[PDB]
A paper describes a structure:
System xc− is a dedicated cystine transporter, importing cystine in exchange for intracellular glutamate. System xc− belongs to the SoLute Carrier 7 (SLC7) family of secondary active amino acid transporters and is a heterodimer, composed of a light chain (also called [name] or [name]) and a heavy chain [name]. The heavy chain [name] is a single transmembrane spanning glycoprotein (also called CD98hc or [name])17,18 necessary for correctly trafficking the transporter to the plasma membrane. The light subunit of human xc− transporter, [name], ([name]), consists of 12 transmembrane helices (TMs), which adopt the canonical APC superfamily fold, wherein TM1-TM5 are related to TM6-TM10 by a pseudo two-fold symmetry axis located in the plane of the membrane.
To understand the molecular basis for substrate selectivity in [name] we determined the structure in complex with l-glutamate (l-Glu) to 3.7 Å. Glutamate was observed in the central binding site, with little overall change in the backbone (root mean square deviation 0.70 Å over 448 Cα atoms). However, in the structure of glutamate bound [name] we observe the density for glutamate ~ 3.3 Å further away from this canonical binding position, sitting closer to TM3 and 8 from the hash motif. The binding of glutamate closer to the hash motif allows for an interaction with Arg135 on TM3 through the gamma carboxylate group. Additional structural changes are observed in the position of Tyr244 on TM6A at the extracellular gate, which moves to hydrogen bond to the carboxylate termini, and Tyr251 on TM6B which interacts with the repositioned Arg135 side chain. Strikingly, the repositioning of Arg135 appears to induce a structural transition of TM8 from an unwound state in the apo structure, to helical in the glutamate bound complex. The structural changes in TM8 observed upon ligand binding suggest an additional mechanism for ligand specificity within this transporter and are consistent with previous observations of an allosteric mechanism in the LAT1 homologue BasC22. In the presence of l-glutamate TM8 adopts a conformation that induces structural rigidity to facilitate the positioning of the small ligand. Finally, when comparing the positions of the two ligands in our structures we observe that γ-carboxylate group of l-glutamate sits in the same position as the second carboxylate in cystine, sitting close to Arg135 and Arg369. Starting from our structure of the glutamate bound inward open state (i) we propose that ligand binding causes the allosteric transition in TM8, which facilitates glutamate recognition and closure of the intracellular gate, via the packing of TM1A and 6B against TM8.
Numbering used by the authors:
A (entry chain B): 45 to 499
B (entry chain A): 168 to 214
The structure:
Amino acid sequence: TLLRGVSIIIGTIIGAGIFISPKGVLQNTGSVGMSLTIWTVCGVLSLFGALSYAELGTTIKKSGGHYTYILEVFGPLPAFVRVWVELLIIRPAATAVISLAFGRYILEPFFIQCEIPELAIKLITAVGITVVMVLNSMSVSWSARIQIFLTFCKLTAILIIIVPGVMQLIKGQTQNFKDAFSGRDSSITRLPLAFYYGMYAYAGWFYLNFVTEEVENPEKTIPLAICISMAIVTIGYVLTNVAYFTTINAEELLLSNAVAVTFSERLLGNFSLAVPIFVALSCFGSMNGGVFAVSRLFYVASREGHLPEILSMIHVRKHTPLPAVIVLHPLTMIMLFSGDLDSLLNFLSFARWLFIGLAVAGLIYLRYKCPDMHRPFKVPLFIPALFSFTCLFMVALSLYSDPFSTGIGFVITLTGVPAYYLFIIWDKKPRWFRIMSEKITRTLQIILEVVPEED
Amino acid sequence: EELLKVAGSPGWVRTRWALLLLFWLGWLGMLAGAVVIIVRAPRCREL
Ligand SMILES: N[C@@H](CCC(=O)O)C(=O)O
């Protein structure tokens, strides 16, 4: 029935973001009650967006995922800029953030009550990235036989924080909730950063292609399943956050990092055996999936001809997405070695949420112009409009906050507009191009041992 | 598919061997750098 789909949605939207967000949320909120309100509103907005994307997937029925929605409603240029930003900002920075978290969690057992000397974080992070990328390039069968174990560990990780939080709550050691909505000022300027931190826990609602043929009875299964999935995941996340707040004071969380190991130290006894290793494995699981998704992304982008066809290319035998990992790994190295978790998250979030809000904003345009596409599920007017307006407005307000961090993302996403000359030009004059590309593309294809899938 | 006949030629595999060997040497070297950073790092004065 619909249980399998609900399970897939649950396993695709949990991620390791719940172990990264709370620190930043508290940092830019300064109040426990306001932070919990931020979690709730982010969950509600995620549910609204998920409904919008379900409507988009049902109303188009064309494969391609995030590409098709933006390309169809707006045109070629927004789609090209979307792929440009996804390749240059979104995927590398998200991978770098997840990998920094994984490195900190894996180095915590060795540094029990100390500070990890920053550089070692980057080195172990990069080693983890390299091993994950070579494993993805090693095999796809063994990269899936281990995905189930990683998902099981992801399910195990949340229980390790939920159940002891339940024990603390029932015993009622909640002295930090006397004045939940008071504390540090944390003026409105930091609200976009709080919001950005808010979504990243719910990372995995987008992508997630829902073709209207796998389900038993569509147009009721997809909305109901997605609604229940977001509802229960939001309940789990708010329970996890209040469990964190049962033991960890606001100050003990603000002047600290890797909140999971601090929780384990403050609550449990023997801790390094369970909490750091399980959370590091949970962060390891998100690593494997992203490479396959970004590799898949290139497959549909080759049809329109926005990126070189070599990016959606595959190995002759021992079929792995080899050419799509060598163009993403060095970018991840650059972000992780030249960025911080506080700044990389904003750098990725600004572009990703600007473009997701723009994509959802197309629903208003699509439903106002030409309202005849045999829409299976008719999402009401207020949901996509409210989601798009809130996302666009608060992303735009995020420029005022930390401008030196999102300025690079803004100038890159504006760099795509001039970058359309790679797609339109009078004469490339191959004295300095084309012919050199022909040598380059052939050299990479020969070196990397790649042939097209079936074309 | 059938067009990668020059990959199975002498010398081309030599380039692949060299590239993979340099990549692995860099990875082991940077892992050793991480290890020496950790080991030479202070040892967490006991409580
Ligand atoms: N899914 C990743 C983000 C990168 C992506 O969009 O693929 C996460 O859970 O953080």
